Structures are given as C-alpha cells and as structure tokens.
Design a protein around this motif. Structure first.
Motif: not given
Lengths: 137, 137, 137, 137, 137, 141, 139, 137
Positions: A5, A39, A41, A108, A113, A115, A120, B66-67, B69-70, B74
């Motif tokens: 991040t 978001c 990509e 990812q 991504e 945001w 986020y 997606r949740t 993977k995030r 992240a």
C-alpha cells in the motif's frame, strides 16, 4: 510482482508518481481503465492483454457480458509513464474514481489499484473479515 | 519444506530471528502479509508468486474475490532478512496479529506462520480433532 | 515399498531402530510428523514432498483446510537416521502417540506408521471388516 | 496373464507349489497380503506396486481409507518363490484365510487368489449370477 | 474383426472346428472363459488382455466387482487351436453353456461367442428389438 | 471427395440372384469388399471394412457388463457379413439380410456419408412418410 | 474469399441454375455439396467444409432414433454439384422443391456455408423470429 | 488491442474516419456486421474469423443458433479502409444502428463498435453498475 500500500498525492496536472519500488515493474507505458468499487486499475500492456482473455471466456451472447465489457474497455486508456515515473490520469477516469488529492495505490500482484484515500478506508471499514470472505470462495 | 514449531521472541525493534533451521530456506528477502485467524504468513518471493496464482483462479467479477484479494495483497510487504537471519515485521502487521513478545513460528511447508503465543495456544485449544477436521475435506 | 508389521522397542534415548528390511528404503534422513488415530508417520523426504502437494489441492480459504495443515505440518520434523539405522523420535511426537516402550511399525507402502503396541491392537480390535470398510470407498 | 483354477495342497511346512503354468508368471518373489472374502492375493511386486497406487487415489483424510490401507498393507508380506516354485505362506495369513490342507488357486489376471477349498465353493455356491452381478456395474 | 453366425457341431471329444473364415483371425492359441447368458467367449490372448483392462477400471473394493472378476477369470482357460483349427472346449465350460451337439458361433468383432443353438435361438426369440435396445444406450 | 463421401439417393433393383449393382458413383468409394450387417428401422448398412472397424470401436465405449449392450452387439455383429464386390460392381446380399430388411425387388440406397443404407422402397417411403420434421428432430439433439 | 458473408438477391433461371455472385464464386472451387437446410433453405458448402460439418454429427449417439432421422433427412438429400465456368450451379430438382424455390432466390452467407432461400419464405422468416438480443440471451 | 471512446462524424457519403490511433490496428480491410443493442461491430478479418469459430461451438441443430447466425452473418460485409483511413458503412447497416451524423467508436479489445451517439449515451444512462453486472457473470 506488485504488492503493498502506498499513500501518494494527485498533483495539479492530475498526475500520480509511481512509488519507485513499483515504477520498476512498469515499463514505458500502462493501460489504466476503471476498476470495481470505484478504483481504476493499472497494468503493463502485456498483463492487460492476459486479463482481457479471461473475459472472452464469457458468453458474449449474454447481455451482461456486453455491459461488463462495455463499461470496462471503453474506458481503458494506455498512458505513458514519464521519465519521472508519473502517470497522467485521464479526466474521465479521475472522475469515475472520485479522485481529488490523496491517492492510495495498492498492489494487486497482477495490477495496481488507485483509490481515493477516504473511499478506500471506507471500503476497508465496511467489508467483512478475511476469514468470513474466504470461507465463501 | 518448512516444518515444525518454534518459540521465539519479538525483540525491541520488532524483529524476529529465523530459527537457523528455517533461515536456510529463506534467501535474501521474503514477502510477509497477514494470514487467517490473525497470524501473518511468510514466504520466499517465488513461493508468494505461486500462492497468488492460486487466487487468480477465482472469479474476480465476484465481490468476495475482490475483498479477499484486497485484504491479502494490500498488506503484503517484502521484507529483507538481515545477515543474522532477522526480519523486521511491519508495524501494521505487528498489530493485525496481536504480536507483542513471545511469537510462535510454525512451518507450513509452503510458508511460515507467525503467531502470538497465546492466540495460537487458544487456537489449538479450540479447533476440533485432526480426524474430525479431515473427515470433512 | 514399505510393507509389513514390525514389533520393536523405544530405547532409553527415545530412539527406534529401523528393521533393516525397512532401513534400506530410507536414505539418510526422514520426515516424521503425527498421523491419524495417534500414530506418527515416517517418510523419505521426497515422499513427504509428494504427500504435501496432495494437500495443496485443498481449498485453503477453508477453515478446516488450515486446521488440518496446521495440525500436520507444525508437527513434522526431519530426523536423521544414524549409522545403526536409528531415528530419535522428537519428544512432542513421543507424547502425541502415547509412545512408551513397545512400538509397532507397519508399512503403508508410501510411508511407515509408528504405533504404541496397545493402541494399535485396540485400533485393530475395534474397526470393522476389510469388506465392510471397502464397500464404502 | 494369470488365468484358471488350480486345486493344490498346503504342505506340512505351510508351503504351496505354484502350478508351473503359473510359476512362469512369477519371477523370484511375490507380495502376499490378505484379500477380500478371506482369500489372500498373490502378486509380482511390480504389480503390487501398481495395485497400491490405485489406492492413493483414495482420500486418506477419510477414516475408512485408512482402515482399508491398514488392514491390507499391514498384512502384505514379500515372500520368495523357492527353486521348486514353492511359496511359504506367512502364519498370520494362513489363519486369516482359513487355510488348512486343500487350497484353490484362481487366476485373476492381475493377481492370484489363494482359497480354502471349502470356503471358495461356499463362496461360489452363494453369490449371484454373472449377469446379475454384471448388470450392477 | 470377427463377424457372422456359424452353425457347427460339437464333436465326440468336445471339440469345435473354427470356421476357416474365422480360424485365420486366431493364431495358435486362445483364451476361452464363460460369457453372459450361457455362452462361452473366445479371444486371441492379446484381445483378452485388452478386455481385462476394461475391468480394472472397476472399484475392486466393491463386492460385486470381485464376484464379477472371480466368476469370469476363475473360468478362463487358454486352449490351443490344433492344426485342423479345432478347439477342445474345457469340461466345465461345456457344462456352463449347456453345450451338447449343435453349436452356434457368432462373431462379436472383439471375440467369438459359442452358443448352444437352441439356447441362442431362445435368446433371440426373447430379447427386444434392435431399436428398442439401442434407444436405451 | 466422392471417394470419401457417400451421399445421395439411388433407386435400384434386386436382381434374380439377390445382387445389387453399386451405382458407379458409389462403387468408386468401396474397394474390393464391404461389410454388410443389419441396420436400424430395417435397413442393412454397407461399409468399407476399415470403416466398419471404426464404427465398432464406437461401441466398445459401451459398458458390456450391461445386458442391453450385449443384446445390441449380438444383434448387430452376428449379422455382419463381408461380401466381395464383383467386377461388375455387384454385391450379393446374404439371404438372412435380404429377409431382415424386407428386400424384394426395388431397393433404395441412400448415402450416409459414413456408410450406405439399403432399403425396401416401400419401407423407406413409409419411414419418410412418418418421422417428424428436420427441425423438430434436430431441436431434440 | 475465405469466409462467406452477406445477402444476395438472385434469380433461379428456367433451367434451374443460379449464378454465384462473383464475390462468392471465388470461395467455391470447382464443385460444392448442396443438401437441404433448416427452415426450408438448402445449404451450400465446399466439399472440404461439408466433410467437417458431418464430423460434428458423428459426435451424436447414432444409437439414438433422432440421430438417425436427422442424418437420413440430411445426407440422403446432399448432392455434389459442379459450379460451371460461368459460376452457375444447377440445383437438383428434389431440392428445388424442398425449399419452395421458384424464381427469386436469396443467398445469405453463413461464414461456413451458403443458404439458398425463396425470397418470400426468407422475408417471412425474418418477419417472424425474435430479436438478435432475445435470441442471443438464450444461447 | 482496441480501447477507448472516440467521438466522430458520419460524413455525407456515409463514411467514417478511423481515429488514426485505431487506423493502425486495421490493415487494408475490415468486416463490419451488426452488433447487439443496435451498434455495428468492426473487425480485422482474422479476428472476424476467430469470433465466428466461437459460434460454431453452438448446436446448429437448435433453432435459436440458426437465427442468431442468420441475423449476424447475413449482414456482415467486408469493407476496404481507404488511404485516408475511411470506411464506407453499408446502407443497410447505417439503418440498423440508427446512424445519422455523430458516431461514437468504442474499443472492445477484440473489435470496434460504431454507435449512434444518442443511442450509446442512453444505453449507458440505463444499464446497471459495473459491479452489479459483474456480480452476475
């Protein structure tokens, strides 16, 4: 590989500077397009190419497949990364994700991504547990 | 193949010393990220690479994918193992798993899991029989 | 192929002498881990490697898959077979299977199982017929 | 391929003489183990090898699969065929199948089944039709 | 490929003369075994080898699979075709198919079936239409 | 390609000696001998031996431990025959077969790409008279 | 000259010949296979392509009653015709009647093959039949 | 790889000028045909070839498949892109999509879609969320 991040800022010309760690991964240009949950990509073109094929495995005779492809690819863009490692984000894309000032880039693996920091955090704030979500896969 | 349990301590600078037995396995750097049941996973980069692929096999058009993977990527990080075989654990990760002082490293063949001693003992305390669990696979 | 049943004794230093017939099969070292029904399995590392993969075909996003992997690999060990063909059995494992004095080694083709003579006999004592059990496979 | 029925006798030293037709098929040694319906199966090691793999395709995480594998392989044996083409049948096996005096060897292509003449006739006497049993495959 | 219907006779020594059209197909020896619906099947050893394999795809841990294999292979025999192209049919098989005098050989591509003429005619007299049967495949 | 595809309809006659003259277009396709066997709906199928070989295999994919598979196999292969096409391109149809399909005089050969089907003219017309639409039947495949 | 596309309005002359549209003539070499299609139309294919279309059928039971009716209705009516020098095809009589061919044909390209229609029947086919979307959704 | 949205005009002779970015992708000629939701698709012939194959994987014995193929390929057209990168749109197609003056070309990776601006904007105005639609795939 893309991980992690990063907290960055949208500059006055709507550009974003790739975090140097990340800048490596991306060559001279990327494909940008709009993601899920507002978001945007980012991908190397080669990877964009492989992501797409994963779609062609979808009906196409199906109305939703077309809506999906239309919403995604008509908004994809191809941007060049400048010497300083900055990416000028297209106008429309700046709006799609409510970009403003204060971006969060999350790796990812496959893609990046972009945001809006507040969105986020809200996303993270809602959204269930890693365990709850995983049990359903 | 990383196997076994190891009792270790989180030093003042939030570092952990890989068990020597284990340090061999791990080259210069590793990827860390948060695991399930509050534990933090450690992997050789190339192993992290293979773990990820196992995900891309998931929809992606699905909200949960997606949740998941995030939540995972992240928080993944890339840390360098120092000469002495120590790894500085990222702050956020130190908190996710209630790491404090008194860590448990378990080999998971594929990766390593870093646990808070109490949490891990409680986890084992709860959780059914090796047989009860296996029958359901 | 490891076949047969062998009655042996756990010596003073917690070692087991491999039956010579069996010692052949196993090179310099083996992996040990706890088995099902309290037994401790023994394998050539290469074979342990192949056994693990058969697990990676399990969800992982599933709670039970993790419990299983944790219960198994956190107790696997890697032991060296000494010149006299003996294996020092790790304390924790000696306790898991109620090892004491009077062991039973049964060949399971793939691996070896180390039992407590009493427990093994009881296991055989209970447990249905070969035909009854096969009909359900 | 092993075909046919052969009536033979268990000598005083618990040996069986391979019917010569059959002795060809088997080289120096065989693997013996107990079969279904109280019979004892005989195989060339190579074949025993292949038979086992057909099991590895079974859960292993399943209680029954482990019972089946323990019941079978813990009783398998590896015997040497002497010059006169005789096989000494392990004591425990001699008992499992109520072997006594008067054996029946039936070729099963893949293996050999050793039976107690009375038991085998009774097996045949009961058991449904070739057509009835087949229709259920 | 074996095709056709042939009317032949069981000679006084229980021999059958392969049809010359058919004898060609069959080298020096054949495997015989009992068929379904009381008929006796005949095959070149190689073909018998391939027919068996089609069975090994059956459980074996299933009681019926065993009864089927036992009923078939315990009666298979290996017979030499003499120079005049005759086959001396084993006693037991002569009785299984109610062979007497007046045989019917029918080609089954893969194998040959030996029938008692009356039994065969009756089999044909009953048994549904070619279409009725095919519809159900 | 005509040597690889049997297509079409041909009206022909069963001569006094129970022989059928292959239509020349068709005779090319078949070499010296063919396999004949009984078909479905009373028709008798004709094939180049190597084709018959491939047709059969498609059967071995059937149980065999199943009673119906055996009946099917027995009804078909016990009545297959191997006939040599003579120099004038004629094929002597086995008696039993002549009866199975109610052959008499006035045969119809239809090309089925893979094989040839021999029909009694009346029976074939009746088959065609009944039987649903190309569309109706295809919708069910 | 690789794929057959488009709609063409053409005429069936008194001798039962159709002139291939030139654009389409290329695609077809010396001969074609003709046979009857669905919805009363007659399909035209290069023989190589007819070969490939058939195989797609062999993937059908054959032991199934319908599979046989389908094969019988199709191949008993296929025909092999030569495309003359002027690019015309003499359509078999029986086929001319199956599709109610008369005078005034419509050829539509179907990538794989060609379909020969009676103008009126084709327009009606189009008049009925649902939307591209409605139909697609069901695939 | 065709991406993006482009606003263009249908000139007086019913031609459209390929956006230069896009003109590269397309060689000398394209295939056009009518798309879904009234839009006209454009493709390099090779891609048109591949898109068709994806159809042949449909029954053909099914009434709907035939309708679909009829509706699509009977209106496909093959057009040459002129030196100035212009494409003359077939009259019939000009009518199918209610093309007039003011077109929108959107990239669809595989092909290009030509829309009437108003129709395209309405399409977008209705039509659900990127997420809502994806969830259903």
């Amino acid at each position: 590989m893309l991980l992690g991040t990063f907290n960055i800022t949208l500059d006055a010309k709507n550009r974003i500077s790739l975090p140097a760690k990340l800048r490596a991964f991306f060559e001279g240009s990327i494909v940008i397009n709009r993601g899920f949950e507002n978001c945007l990509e980012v991908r190397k073109p080669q990877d964009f190419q492989k992501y797409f094929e994963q779609f062609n495995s979808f009906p196409s005779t199906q109305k939703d497949t077309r809506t999906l492809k239309r919403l995604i690819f008509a908004n994809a863009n191809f941007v060049d990364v400048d010497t300083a490692g900055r990416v000028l984000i297209p106008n429309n894309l700046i709006n799609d994700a409510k970009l403003d000032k204060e971006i969060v880039l999350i790796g990812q693996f496959d893609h990046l991504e972009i945001w809006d920091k507040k969105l986020y955090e809200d996303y993270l704030a809602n959204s269930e547990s890693l365990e709850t979500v995983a049990e359903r896969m």
